[model samples]
Target: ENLYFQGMKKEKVEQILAEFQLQEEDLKKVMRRMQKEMDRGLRLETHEEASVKMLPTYVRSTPEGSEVGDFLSLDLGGTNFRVMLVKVGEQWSVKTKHQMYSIPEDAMTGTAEMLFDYISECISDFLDKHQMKHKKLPLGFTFSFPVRHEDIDKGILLNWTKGFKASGAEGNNVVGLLRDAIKRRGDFEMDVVAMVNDTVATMISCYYEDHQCEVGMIVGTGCNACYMEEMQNVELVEGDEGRMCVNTEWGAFGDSGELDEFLLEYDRLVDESSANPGQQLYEKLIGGKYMGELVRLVLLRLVDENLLFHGEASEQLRTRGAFETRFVSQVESDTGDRKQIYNILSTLGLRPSTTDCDIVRRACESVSTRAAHMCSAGLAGVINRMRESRSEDVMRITVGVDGSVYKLHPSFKERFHASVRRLTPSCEITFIESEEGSGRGAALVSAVACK
Candidate 1:
């Protein structure tokens, strides 16, 4: 009577999976909620009350064909930071030389002065290699954390995310942080013209490849997106002439209990255990850093129910993050033999039987599917909003995405594209992938900002 799993009844797996299901109605509800939050985040009076914090990037324009310059870009979002010197001449003449340096844990956790000092010192060493210390080229900084921009060169850090805990930057201007540091270092001068989030930079860089790219997204360690919105819809800025890139830090969508109903108990475990507890709610559900832990938590529950490992679990499995985030992709990419999944479990000291592998695979699929569905719903809201902003019957837009979960996960993109298409019937959305991180895009932003 059973089809795939011989160890357990098919109905049993379905019962556990029902919790992770996001049907068509569920997607509609989440999409409507995203639209409502986006409107609130756009207005100055209501923005303080909204959870999505649809912050503006002040990047008014994308890459024009005429942008040419010798620029420097600083990318600092992950554990390591990269400084790239981009030589921009014509279309194919643009070249880049970058040097990466590892950031110490103390610097990440230290005060603003300490963190900026270390960054300044690192750039000094980087310039020594290129021998460009004398010339002060225009610079743009790609700060991936949540920031509220008042201008192209003015940004105030709202809070830190993605495992950053540096003090003195919670409510201070990040541009001032770097400017003061540069003054103190007194080694090399940097013409800091602009500061942008990675999502905006990704959009700018992807625009060079495809001019239709008006949106940028990240699904790696963090999940966020930026899209060009009408100036009239943006209540914070005074202008109503052109569009500006709005960073929809959508990961924090459920912070004010917007998605409390969709969250599972396993999510609660991963959330409270994280550095930013009760924050990045949607990100924990979708981003690459937290996807594997969700799977591990489900496996633990199956163990408790005697559905896996004969009601036993490994000590390594009991520890947090032992499952490893990349393992989720590995398990999902396994063939019919399930050898790779078995090997992955073996590393966790789990001797998974055929039934256990089946159960685990289903669990992985359910969680990731739910994530793809939710992300698609949010994106649909953005696309639909864009379509509505203009008096058009149909709209065609491109979204530039740069992240691990979307790129590495085998079928995540397929499910995401399908769901996004299904949700937004009035728009044709094209998704483009950007190079790994925000490098050339930052330099391009500076070029546009200064030119």
Candidate 2:
């Protein structure tokens, strides 16, 4: 009953939408690339130049639900940074108080000193607000960047992502950077005990509710993953008796041309215009940070081809990031009557006819659907690898997921979950959504270490 076929430029819309569609074989191929890259990343010497830095997290265990402490946690990976104070009391009793503050452009793209100094200031404020300045608490810093961890507390920064350009931070230990930031204050003291990526924090955080939760993933401003790995397979660390968590910074997956065949013109345009161009290639494809820009690019292309908006672009459409990611969700969620799409387009200063709204909605669906499928392919590789490493034909697992895109978008979770089930048919997978921020998980990590 819909009118997708009745439009004059329906063929043009079909042609553009087809570029975002991936067949079953294509999904499997991307999954294979993920698996192959993980194997490449696990080998000792090969990892020196591996595109995916499957770095060891040195976290050998998850919580047993009895760790006790009043710990501090700081999480930064998104546009905002959060500081939290978690009180782990009696058995399985935990509560947290957190303050989230946005970062200025100066702090985000400034020198490392400026950034960390700002971090210290934020913490100082948090402590004063909570009246914990005199308390020397164990701190867990969730600096969600690609880091090489030789020790639990000594995570050396390999590089920055999510548009972070703090220069002196790379190649330096982020824990040290935080420690130095705190020491400079001299008004408060904290024992920064552990560091982890957001993925690890989410995984370990969710472990309290479900012990089978071994995989932690994020699809917010950036995409990342971490999972429990056999210690013997982690070449950077010693011992084969137990397993450890490996932060598969898989965002860098396509940098070495692994995704060249799948790269469309819009993808290349997104890369070329990105701040960290040629970096975090896989993340660029599936993460929330780039999805809006990608959609904007496609919309502009449709306009240029006379398939949308009566062949004219508004000022907002011409500017970069004018089409925010939320607009995509809004457009996709719009029910047939078309008021939602009209209101959204109107906010962007665009004049769209009923047919234009239909095409725009379809374009958003295509982009977001592709993102879910690609993410599922990556997760499939991870789950399949886990099953293979254990020599098991079938296994039960739980994935702990957190991110604005996964949690907020209208259909992303359904599409992502269905594709994952299809790709790993043998595995019984349970996806647990995080109720709290990953910062709480960081505090849990510190509390567990203390136990």
What TM-scores do the predictions have?
A: 0.94, 0.97
Q: Candidate 1, residues 1-451: lDDT per residue as tens digits?
A: 2444454543576687789999899899999998899999999999999999899888886335546778888888877888888875673224478888899999888888888888898888988898987888888899998898889899899998877888998899998998898889998999898898989888888886788899999888888899998888888888898898999999899899988899999999999888799999988889877888898898888788777787799998898888776788788898969898899888889888776787788888988898899999889988898899978898888999988889999888999999999999978888999873477777777777786
Write down the lDDT of every candidate, Cα atoms only: 0.85, 0.87
- Give candidate 2 misplaced runs (Cα > 4 Å): 1-6, 62-67, 91-93
- Backbone steric clashes in candidate 2, count: 0
User: Mind giving the per-residue lDDT tens digits that candidate 2 earns over 1-451?
Assistant: 2555446587778888899999989999999999999989988988987898899998886425446778888998978989988776562324468898898889889998889888999999999998998988998898899999988889789988989998799999898898898788778998888898899989987886888999999989999899999888988788886789999999999999999999989999988888898998889888989998889999999999988987899999888888788888888888799899899888889988888888888888888999999999999999999998876688899999999889889999999999998999889999998766477778778876655
Predicted structure 2, TM vs. truth: 0.97
Candidate 1 ranges beyond 4 A from true positions:
1-6, 9-11, 62-67, 91-95
